[PDB]
Ligand binder design. Structure first.
Ligand SMILES: Cc1cc2nc3c(=O)[nH]c(=O)nc-3n(C[C@H](O)[C@H](O)[C@H](O)COP(=O)(O)O)c2cc1C
Length: 364
């Protein structure tokens, strides 16, 4: 039965009936051409509608934002129409869903960029990693990332407008909230990190300059819709996709959080460590974050129901986002509430493919 995990929580403009959230999970099953959400994806989300809040897989704000074959977009008419069906299905089950919007930046490949050109980023530095494309049969494959082109100063306003337009589209698509992907080494994080950002204009250098882009985006989207409809995900501590949060990560993190707090947005989603290792957050750091943000705080990263209850009980976080447990358990809320066993995970089908390993996991 637990304690607080199953109690309501006001998240900006909506109210979650429990604090068990579904973390944003890239599954790469969209239709190409078009990067269009599918009926299968609709069923997948609908099966998980009992979550306090569903945060969708990362979705492109524009065609240029694309970095993975199979990832959906929210910039075209066909994409908007498809997502409207998915959010409607979730609402039909009385759930709530937020769309995570991103721009992959340098974690992309020229073959899936508009015109087949090099992807963009803060600086012209290859991420030295791989991304996922699809072969001639539609199967997911890994490929080395393409060296990016540094965005020109005059191109930044366009990036901000793309985020603004995507939120406008999200609103029409029926999403309850939007989550800006400012983590895991993607575009916004590429600007935030001193290791991936070597710009000498006002978007590089000091933390104030490095956080400039993300804050302009936050302001742009709050103005487009409403601050209580805006959430943001950050991974300010540690190293992700070869992007390292500088030698002053903690100080820089608190600066960013205080600035975000000023906009009165719906929530702050903290991805504590990537799938690989990572130093755990100290309660002291959690307290410092807590006192700087006045909205909902979501914790994520190998959480257990026990850890969630502990931190929620200490008043350090308000909700917990589960990723892999949600992939394998559509009715995770019921299972954690009943203290039931969970379905075993099948990692080989996390990315790409079809129904198997997707709408495949049974409910109690
Ligand atoms: C298959 C898969 C896809 C993911 N895709 C996303 C995503 O689209 N956006 C994001 O911010 N994080 C993404 N993550 C990270 C998850 O949201 C989550 O924070 C992470 O899996 C750690 O939580 P867990 O231990 O509960 O799975 C992904 C992770 C996995 C396993």
């Amino acid at each position: 039965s637990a304690e607080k995990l199953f109690t309501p929580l006001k998240v900006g403009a909506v109210t979650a009936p429990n604090r068990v959230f579904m973390a944003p999970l890239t599954r790469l099953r969209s239709i190409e051409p078009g990067d269009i959400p599918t009926p299968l994806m609709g069923e997948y989300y609908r099966q998980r509608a009992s979550a306090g809040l569903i945060i969708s897989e990362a979705t492109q704000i524009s065609a240029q934002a694309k970095g993975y074959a199979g990832a959906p977009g929210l910039h075209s008419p066909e994409q908007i129409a498809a997502w409207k069906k998915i959010t409607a299905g979730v609402h039909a089950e009385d759930g709530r869903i937020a769309v995570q919007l991103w721009h992959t930046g340098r974690i992309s490949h020229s073959s899936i960029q508009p015109g087949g050109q090099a992807p963009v980023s803060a600086s012209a530095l290859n991420a030295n990693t791989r991304t996922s494309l699809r072969d001639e049969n539609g199967n997911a494959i890994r490929v080395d990332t393409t060296t990016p082109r540094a965005l020109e100063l005059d191109e930044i306003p366009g990036i901000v407008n793309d985020f603004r337009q995507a939120v406008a589209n999200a609103r029409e698509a029926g999403f309850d909230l939007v989550e800006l992907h400012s983590a895991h080494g993607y575009l916004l994080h590429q600007f935030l990190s001193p290791s991936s950002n070597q710009r000498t204009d006002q978007y590089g250098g000091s933390v104030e300059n490095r956080a400039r882009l993300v804050l302009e985006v936050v302001d742009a989207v709050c103005n487009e819709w409403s601050a209580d409809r805006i959430g943001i995900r950050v991974s300010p501590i540690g190293t992700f996709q070869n992007v390292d949060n500088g030698p002053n990560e903690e100080a820089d993190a608190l600066y960013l959080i205080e600035e975000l707090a000023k906009r009165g947005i719906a929530y702050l989603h903290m991805s504590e460590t990537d799938l690989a290792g990572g130093k755990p957050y100290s309660e002291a750091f959690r307290q410092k974050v807590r006192e700087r943000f006045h909205g909902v705080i979501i914790g994520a990263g190998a959480y257990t129901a026990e850890k969630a209850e502990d931190l929620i009980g200490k008043g350090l976080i308000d909700a917990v986002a589960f990723g892999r447990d949600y992939i394998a358990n559509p009715d995770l809320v019921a299972r954690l509430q009943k203290k039931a066993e969970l379905n075993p995970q099948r990692p080989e089908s996390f990315y790409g493919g079809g129904a198997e390993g997707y709408t495949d996991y049974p409910s109690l």
